[PDB]
Amino acid sequence: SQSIIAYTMSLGAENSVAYSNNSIAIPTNFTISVTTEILP
Amino acid sequence: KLIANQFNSAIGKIQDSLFSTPSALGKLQDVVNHNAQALNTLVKQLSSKFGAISSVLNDILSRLDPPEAEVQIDRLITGRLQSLQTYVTQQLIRAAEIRASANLAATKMSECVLGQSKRVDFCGKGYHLMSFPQSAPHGVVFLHVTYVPAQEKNFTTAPAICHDGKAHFPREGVFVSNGTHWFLTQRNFYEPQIITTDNTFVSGNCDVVIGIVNNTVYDPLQLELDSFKEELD
Amino acid sequence: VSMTKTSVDCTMYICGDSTECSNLLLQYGSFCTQLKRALTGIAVEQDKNTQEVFAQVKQIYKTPPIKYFGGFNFSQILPDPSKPSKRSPIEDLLFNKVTLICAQKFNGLTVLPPLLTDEMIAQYTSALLAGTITSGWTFGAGPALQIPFPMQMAYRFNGIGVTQNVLYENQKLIANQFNSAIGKIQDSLFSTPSALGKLQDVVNHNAQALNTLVKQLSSKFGAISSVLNDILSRLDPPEAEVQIDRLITGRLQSLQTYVTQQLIRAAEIRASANLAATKMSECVLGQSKRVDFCGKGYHLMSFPQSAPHGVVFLH
Amino acid sequence: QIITTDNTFVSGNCDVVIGIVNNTVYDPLQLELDSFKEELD
Ligand SMILES: *[C@@H]1O[C@H](CO)[C@@H](O[C@@H]2O[C@H](CO)[C@@H](O[C@@H]3O[C@H](CO)[C@@H](O)[C@H](O)[C@@H]3O)[C@H](O)[C@H]2NC(C)=O)[C@H](O)[C@H]1NC(C)=O
Ligand SMILES: *[C@@H]1O[C@H](CO)[C@@H](O[C@@H]2O[C@H](CO)[C@@H](O[C@@H]3O[C@H](CO)[C@@H](O)[C@H](O)[C@@H]3O)[C@H](O)[C@H]2NC(C)=O)[C@H](O)[C@H]1NC(C)=O
Ligand SMILES: *[C@@H]1O[C@H](CO)[C@@H](O[C@@H]2O[C@H](CO)[C@@H](O[C@@H]3O[C@H](CO)[C@@H](O)[C@H](O)[C@@H]3O)[C@H](O)[C@H]2NC(C)=O)[C@H](O)[C@H]1NC(C)=O
Ligand SMILES: *[C@@H]1O[C@H](CO)[C@@H](O[C@@H]2O[C@H](CO)[C@@H](O)[C@H](O)[C@H]2NC(C)=O)[C@H](O)[C@H]1NC(C)=O
Ligand SMILES: *[C@@H]1O[C@H](CO)[C@@H](O[C@@H]2O[C@H](CO)[C@@H](O)[C@H](O)[C@H]2NC(C)=O)[C@H](O)[C@H]1NC(C)=O
Ligand SMILES: *[C@@H]1O[C@H](CO)[C@@H](O[C@@H]2O[C@H](CO)[C@@H](O)[C@H](O)[C@H]2NC(C)=O)[C@H](O)[C@H]1NC(C)=O
Ligand SMILES: *[C@@H]1O[C@H](CO)[C@@H](O)[C@H](O)[C@H]1NC(C)=O
Ligand SMILES: *[C@@H]1O[C@H](CO)[C@@H](O)[C@H](O)[C@H]1NC(C)=O
Ligand SMILES: *[C@@H]1O[C@H](CO)[C@@H](O)[C@H](O)[C@H]1NC(C)=O
């Protein structure tokens, strides 16, 4: 069924970046993204 | 063609997002609601007595002689004047907030729509390409078109290439390796190119840079020379 | 970045545990409602301000277990796993310098906790530091792309008109100057009590506003007594109503003054938080060409640190 | 300015770019070579 629950909020997913002395990540593709900003 | 198709898809997504999400324009509805509250409260305060026998001036004047009516009227005047002072003060505070928002909107109009901005997250998420304004009630909506990197690949790198006692540095790019050969690529899009004397510049010897690797740097002029007089005679 | 979130029980401030006073208060209309909404709006705004300044990262990034970044020592800005709360040495210093029983001001005045705890803010700061250190400027614009730190710095040097070979030839000098400067930051903040004055001033202004609001309850405002219990104990309702209305007028004006000045301070804090969020995006998640926006000199990089009710940027 | 191999860069063939036009791109090195050993012997 359903109920109201309480929890400690999550801040985000974890991501361990593979940092190394001689390792680089380079985009092989791209996305064109359109977002919206609303101002009074 | 890919860029145009991604743009057109993103615009359709903007229409679907705004259409299907009632809360998308909440900031402007909140401004309208706050002004509606302020005025509904200001009018409702007229029904309060503030200690008077009645909230209606016509009933006070109908029932009492001027000398008593003046007391009841001064109680109502004090209450109504304080209600107006509260309304005006909160309108001035809201006006300051709206002015700050309008100044931000004008700055974004100039820097995002009339140009291209390098300010991170100022003109949307990603690297800014362009923006388009749209009018909205009591406000402006900006559609921010950005370039978002995707599908990154994992490469080996080096700060410099050592050729013949000299350290070669990229002019515009980063050195990468696919595990067998070294190439120079632009940083924001993988496009391997042969490492040459035109792509790189030379400064110093090979014993200074930490992490320098050994690779051939190609010089077109020498290769042509080595073919040009190959016969010799 | 944020302001203390307060809440006022209007009836209990003006007419604490007095039915006769409450009934007289009802004749002034919905003033308690307007004040309640104003303080609720401020309380919500302060959490919005904290969220906008610190919650700018989609994911919580972690540093490698091998904390070697070309010779650049970040141990004084990265979280210290040994101590509870997982704050950096600098963050511990910043929190130490600035200072459920409602023991004080129990006159209808309460303080609400922030939505994000100090630990959550420290976690956002840690994620931002890990992202900048391990992914450079690509972290802010999309997916985090690993880059060796000395190459990130060489790129940042190109960003200011200095070639990459200048950094690579002088990499040891650059790392040593950086480490010395960080040690100087710790010594400067530790030895200068006034370094964090802006945040202590915010705390002091909120403390003054509440101490003044409570102290005003002792004023008579023309009444025979400042205490409602003594007026009701001594006088019959018809005379008590006059004395009570004098006290109601004084207390309501005191609350209106408090709320108005909290709204003005809230606007100032909002402007500061908006500046802090802009600096977080342009200084920490990128490299800025705006002169003096991200520190004195040509900007290379910035590192956030959490502080009570605020943010400290190391430029 | 004259369109040369120093002013421009090369990426891909001529069948990809929409609106590409046909024009000579001048290469200084080849021209010098074509004069340098013109006599041949
Ligand atoms: C870079 O990413 C884009 C997507 O953002 C890639 O283009 C996409 O390629 C897939 C195929 O791998 C397309 O899916 C196919 O679409 C046709 C449409 O008729 C359909 O019949 C197929 O069954 C399949 O669904 C997809 O539509 C296409 N997207 C766009 C916007 O063109 C692109 O290939 C990637 N490039 C590289 C080098 O990875
Ligand atoms: C990065 O820098 C830190 C310090 O800036 C290095 O760790 C150690 O830090 C302490 C101070 O925090 C240094 O002084 C020590 O202080 C204690 C205080 O009780 C004292 O008992 C010790 O005798 C010492 O004076 C300590 O010297 C320093 N460690 C070293 C080896 O110098 C940290 O090691 C640095 N990281 C790298 C990778 O170099
Ligand atoms: C550019 O300026 C830097 C300083 O910001 C110069 O590096 C500094 O050079 C002096 C020597 O001229 C170093 O002093 C020496 O340090 C050793 C440490 O063991 C000490 O034993 C000596 O008695 C003397 O005190 C100083 O430490 C060093 N600073 C750093 C951060 O490396 C650099 O040489 C200058 N470059 C040019 C081209 O002028
Ligand atoms: C790294 O890239 C090079 C260049 O593309 C690869 O070598 C080439 O592979 C293609 C495969 O069709 C051949 O046609 C070329 O002749 C090769 N060139 C040379 C100079 O060998 C190489 O295999 C790649 N290595 C990895 C691990 O991806
Ligand atoms: C790059 O090539 C040079 C030679 O052109 C290497 O230098 C030699 O390194 C060996 C290492 O055992 C020494 O014994 C030689 O005396 C070196 N010769 C010279 C002229 O320096 C260099 O080590 C190579 N670098 C890498 C990373 O492989
Ligand atoms: C640029 O020149 C090329 C030839 O160097 C043209 O390609 C030819 O176009 C004709 C068009 O009728 C074809 O019949 C030939 O078979 C093509 N040859 C080759 C090798 O592609 C090209 O069309 C010219 N472009 C423009 C815009 O004039
Ligand atoms: C980078 O090089 C240093 C050289 O001392 C080494 O200690 C460190 O572990 C290396 N980093 C990685 C990820 O291998
Ligand atoms: C990149 O490649 C190395 C091996 O060359 C590997 O160890 C590393 O995990 C790779 N990165 C990722 C994100 O998998
Ligand atoms: C509530 O009281 C108990 C003791 O009766 C105490 O142990 C506990 O910590 C208290 N909780 C709070 C939130 O103060």
Numbering used by the authors:
A (entry chain A): 689 to 728
B (entry chain A): 921 to 1153
C (entry chain C): 729 to 827, 849 to 1064
D (entry chain B): 1113 to 1153
The authors write:
The JN.1-sublineage KP.3.1.1 recently emerged as the globally prevalent SARS-CoV-2 variant, demonstrating increased infectivity and antibody escape.
Prior studies also indicated that the JN.1 spike protein exhibited either a “one RBD up” or “all RBD down” conformation. Structural alignment of SARS-CoV-2 WT, JN.1, and JN.1.11 spike proteins with KP.3.1.1 showed that the NTD and RBD exhibited greater rootmean-square deviations (RMSDs) than S2. V1104L has little effect on any conformational changes; V1104 and L1104 are both surrounded by a conserved hydrophobic pocket formed by P1090, F1095, I1115, and T1120 in the same protomer. Besides, while F456L alone did not affect hACE2 binding (JN.1.11.1 has F456L compared to JN.1.11), Q493E alone substantially reduced binding affinity, which is also consistent with prior research and is likely due to the electrostatic repulsion between hACE2-E35 and RBD-E49317. Additionally, S31Δ did not markedly affect the thermostability of the spike protein compared to JN1.11, JN1.11.1, and engineered variants, as assessed by nano differential scanning fluorimetry, but retained a substantially increased melting temperature (Tm) over the SARS-CoV-2 wild type (WT) (Wuhan-Hu-1; GenBank: QHD43416.1) (Tm of 46° C vs. 32° C).
